[PDB]
Design a protein around this ligand. Sequence first.
Ligand SMILES: Nc1ncnc2c1ncn2[C@@H]1O[C@H](COP(=O)(O)OP(=O)(O)O)[C@@H](O)[C@H]1O
Ligand SMILES: [Mg+2]
Ligand SMILES: [Zn+2]
Lengths: 315, 90
Amino acid sequence: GVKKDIEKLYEAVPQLSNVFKIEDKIGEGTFSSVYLATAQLQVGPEEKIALKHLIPTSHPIRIAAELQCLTVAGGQDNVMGVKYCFRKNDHVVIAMPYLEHESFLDILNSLSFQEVREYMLNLFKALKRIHQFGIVHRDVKPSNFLYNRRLKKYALVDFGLAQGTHDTKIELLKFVQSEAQQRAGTPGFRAPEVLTKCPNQTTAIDMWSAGVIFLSLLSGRYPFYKASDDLTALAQIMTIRGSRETIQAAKTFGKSILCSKEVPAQDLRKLCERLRGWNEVPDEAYDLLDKLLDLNPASRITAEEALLHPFFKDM
Amino acid sequence: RLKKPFVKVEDMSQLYRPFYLQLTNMPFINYSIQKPCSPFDGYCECCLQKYEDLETHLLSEQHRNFAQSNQYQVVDDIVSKLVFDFVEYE
Ligand SMILES: Nc1ncnc2c1ncn2[C@@H]1O[C@H](COP(=O)(O)OP(=O)(O)O)[C@@H](O)[C@H]1O
Ligand SMILES: [Mg+2]
Ligand SMILES: [Zn+2]
């Protein structure tokens, strides 16, 4: 089972044997698996470590890019850092500090309103950090934002899908080809300019994604947009934000959307309250949500703007 | 022309193919379904080729050549910038 995987991991990357007691599998995705391990630090303490084993069909550029995002931007502001990295031919293992975290589903409908504010504050700190460096995460969603409720710690992880802004400070991100030019994420967290294959895609796409998270938090529903492909996510979006509004906003980025059934935009407070200090959620909450789910990527709020939103007065 | 309901997306500069969605029903927001439900409720990058089985592709000579080549220098360069602070055993 997992035992056979661990053994194959050791056999794939012999140096791990000299360093890690690999204890468990804690993650599996299309492009990597992640293990819980314990090691000894030269400085004294034993430390719990997350080992991300990347699939060996991965391009070395793609591998280096994720590693570089972690090296350069990580370690600070709720962005996961890297301790070390080990390779043996096509097998690369990235070693990170392990953060014990909740399941999003699990704590979803038990969080206090203050914990929601705090969660969103701390996510925007991480997005602020990565966006400074010109990193578009492209996969912002609760499984990639690790949350320890007890210690109140957070970490944005998984740069396996990252791309660079045209002026990215992460030199290697320039070699990741645009999906738009010719690795997809989860349709449900993808902004409309992404869903419609807009060639220009900016850090605003991550801000939409944090808007989708906030929406799950305010409504008590996750996954909010359950879709197996991009246009299904788009049809669902038009149901929330209105099809006229979406068709209008898509023109401003070069896309023409035809929808046969006109649906109206929902008031965000009503939608969330019908779905769901929860007795006095301030207007500012729904106001921030509206700015994150701005269908126009140019006017959509930025991460440093969000942190200055009155929703976060005074933290 | 198109059977309803549909969504159609096209690029105003024709730099893209038109794409479509046709469903039986448009999504409808269901407030009645219970929390926490939705209200709406490989290929090798190194060898640039599709495969039917991973474990055998990893053993193929094409892949095994790549795996042992210089192409991971880009990774090693970053790796030789990080500080190793674990205790290593013989
Ligand atoms: N540094 C970490 N500490 C604790 N758990 C982690 C860490 N990194 C990843 N995990 C767990 O492993 C999962 C997979 O890691 P991720 O980097 O998202 O790769 P992928 O989505 O490609 O599997 C995460 O969703 C998380 O639950
Ligand atoms: Mg992930
Ligand atoms: Zn291959």
